């Protein structure tokens, strides 16, 4: 909670790169993480009201750190002040947030349940027995009801149609409609499968909701993040600039958490840091098209006689597939399932209910056999 310098162990892609250089490069390395939470941006110095970007970069101008090895985006505002190497990655800003999709366990059968009639007509299947008796007149109840149940269920018990041929015509009709209903249900079961209830708000650049912010758009970034420059310079986004500012965070861990905690509905940041996390948890989603593309490069104080060599070295890292090998090497280890539809053992519980009903059934069965015994 109290933060003071601390000796720590750090391991990274940038570290492996740095040591790769260190073998390739004569220079020896000692690394300490910057005290400032953010890389930093040029800002008014309080009463002075004019100041160096500070953070990681100002320490660099200041000479605290001669060279900056970090995943930092490369931009002109910074660029005038310092030399930058060729950029290693080309990551683009997307918005990392999602809502778990809503799907239904009770929805498919429900099509009947709510229809109500599905049950009532079953009873009327039973009623058809009375009509059949009428057919019998002027030319067993348990068997009839059972027979009616079979047509819903294709029982094929034995006795078959009433002696009157005419009476039997209804059997064809009721089974016809029963069949139709089942099939129709199946089609409506597929209607559930059609889905598409979810609405995508991802196209941010062309998005309507994002542009006209509100209390339903509790939106942020990292306090002092490069996108803030975009909002700054983009007078077009001034509205959003402030809307964003009021909700900003010191770091990604808190910024990702807010969306995860659901404190904030949306989060705005760049791809290299965010996508890996997107793989890491994945409930949350990225949406739209990366905007404001940039390639990562090392930051160093001006005139560094090595930057050029570094640029050649990282160039080689690309040329020999090293850069590439490393990126696959860590990122590759994290994956997100492609959109697909699976049943997932949800709707099966109604059948669980059925099996519970079986037990009830056979319990009732002792009284059913009592009836035979009763007629003893």
């Amino acid at each position: 909670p109290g933060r003071p310098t601390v000796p720590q162990c750090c391991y990274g892609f940038c570290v492996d790169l740095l040591i790769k250089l260190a073998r390739e490069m004569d220079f020896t390395y000692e690394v300490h993480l910057v005290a400032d939470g953010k890389f930093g941006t040029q800002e008014r110095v309080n009463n002075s009201n004019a100041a160096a970007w500070n953070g990681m970069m100002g320490e660099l101008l200041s000479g605290q750190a001669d060279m900056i090895v970090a995943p930092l985006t490369i931009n002109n505002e910074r660029a005038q002040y310092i030399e930058f190497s060729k950029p290693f990655k080309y990551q683009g800003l997307t918005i990392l947030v999602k809502k778990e999709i809503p799907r239904s366990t009770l929805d498919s059968f429900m099509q009947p349940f709510q229809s109500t009639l599905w049950l009532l007509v079953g009873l009327s299947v039973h009623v058809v027995a009375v009509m059949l008796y009428l057919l019998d007149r002027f030319s067993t109840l348990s068997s009839a009801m059972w027979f009616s149940w079979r047509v819903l269920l294709n029982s094929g018990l034995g006795e078959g149609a009433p002696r009157s041929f005419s009476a039997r015509i209804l059997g064809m009709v009721w089974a016809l409609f029963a069949m139709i209903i089942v099939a129709s249900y199946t089609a409506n079961l597929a209607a559930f499968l059609v889905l598409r209830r979810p609405e995508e708000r991802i196209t941010g650049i062309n998005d309507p909701r994002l542009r006209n912010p509100s209390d339903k758009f509790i939106y942020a970034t990292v306090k002092q993040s490069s996108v803030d420059i975009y909002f700054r310079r983009q007078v077009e986004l001034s509205t959003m600039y402030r809307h964003m500012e009021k909700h900003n965070y010191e770091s990604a861990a808190e910024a990702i958490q807010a969306v995860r905690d659901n404190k904030l509905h949306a989060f705005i940041w760049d791809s290299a840091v965010l996508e890996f996390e997107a793989s890491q948890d994945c409930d949350l989603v990225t949406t739209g098209e990366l905007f404001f593309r940039s390639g990562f490069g090392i930051g160093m104080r001006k005139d560094s006689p090595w930057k050029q060599e570094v640029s050649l070295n990282i160039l080689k890292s690309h040329e020999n597939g090293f850069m590439e090998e490393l990126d696959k090497t860590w990122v590759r280890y994290q994956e997100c399932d492609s959109r697909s539809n699976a049943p997932a053992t949800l709707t099966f519980e109604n059948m669980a209910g059925v099996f519970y009903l079986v037990a009830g059934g056979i319990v009732a069965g002792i009284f059913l056999i009592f009836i035979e015994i009763a007629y003893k």
Binding site: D107, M110, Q111, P112, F113, Q114, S115, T116, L117, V121, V128, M131, L134, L135, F138, S139, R150, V151, N154, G156, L157, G158, E159, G160, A161, S164, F165, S166, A167, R168, I169, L170, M172, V173, W174, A175, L176, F177, M179, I180, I181, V182, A183, S184, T186, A187, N188, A190, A191, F192, V194, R196, E199, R201, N206, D207, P208, R209, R211, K216
Partner: protein, 281 residues
Amino acid sequence: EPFSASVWVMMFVMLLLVSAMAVFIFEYFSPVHGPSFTIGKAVWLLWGLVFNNSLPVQNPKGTTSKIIVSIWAFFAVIFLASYTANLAAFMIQRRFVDQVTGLSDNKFQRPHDYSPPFRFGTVPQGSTERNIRNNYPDMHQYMVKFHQKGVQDALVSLKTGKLDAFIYDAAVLNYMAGRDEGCKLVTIGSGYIFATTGYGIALQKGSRWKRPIDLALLQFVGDGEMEELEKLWLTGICHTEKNEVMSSQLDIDNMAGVFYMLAAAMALSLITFVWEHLFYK
């Protein structure tokens, strides 16, 4: 019904094929108990096998019938597959769109007659009030009785059902659909307002900054920005692709239609009872 133009007749034709099959079969059955009832079962037995099986029926023996039947069974199966495909197509057909005639509809023109209580209304001091009074004065009075004031009043009322439906400048209402939370509000049919107008700007009658103003405005029409402004401010969520819907209540009135066919069959069986009831000597 599509199967009916060609398919329904062929089903009758299918029964005729069955008679020929039985004829081959009768000879095999009796080179020269009461299996003769089988042809009848096939009309019924064959028919059951046609629709999703579910017929105890009778067991035909004649060797030819098994092949002939398997040929029919194949047909029945692909029929069902075809039927499933048609149903599959319907899932597409099962797109639920609002059923209303808007201003033209009797629900609006003669509101009192319907037993159910519903009311249409519009904002006070609007240009339309007059149109309503110059369309139906009584309707305007009804609107005045149920007056609201803010967009959100109407909105909430609509979301709560306090307000049956709501008329306003469509452009704004379209924008409301452009901003609905949950997408529960739609325009009438296609969305033609049925009142046709566009926005205008006042000028002193004497003043004509407008004739000069006009020139600047058109090119502005021609210019891409109007559409930028459209995209800037008028862009709306949930663009109306022929909408598609599904139901957990299925269809009970369509089901009733089915049941009416069913009921007709019941009547027909009563008629056959009558025939036996009054069977000729």
